[PDB]
Amino acid sequence: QFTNVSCSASSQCWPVCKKLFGTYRGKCMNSKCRCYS
């Protein structure tokens, strides 16, 4: 879905997404990480 951490690109978000949801399918939107399913 969305996250609560700032991002400096989608790359560094993939691990976030992975930690949060369990997916390595994330993006950086409004300088915040994002995740998918």
Side-chain angles (χ1 to χ4, degrees), residues 2-37:
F2 251 125
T3 68
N4 191 62
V5 291
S6 183
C7 56
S8 52
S10 299
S11 56
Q12 56 88 271
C13 180
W14 304 332
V16 175
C17 179
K18 167 279 190 297
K19 178 62 180 63
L20 302 179
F21 303 100
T23 33
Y24 216 92
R25 286 172 57 121
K27 296 296 294 175
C28 174
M29 282 292 103
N30 57 282
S31 186
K32 191 187 73 175
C33 178
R34 191 175 176 117
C35 195
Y36 301 138
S37 300

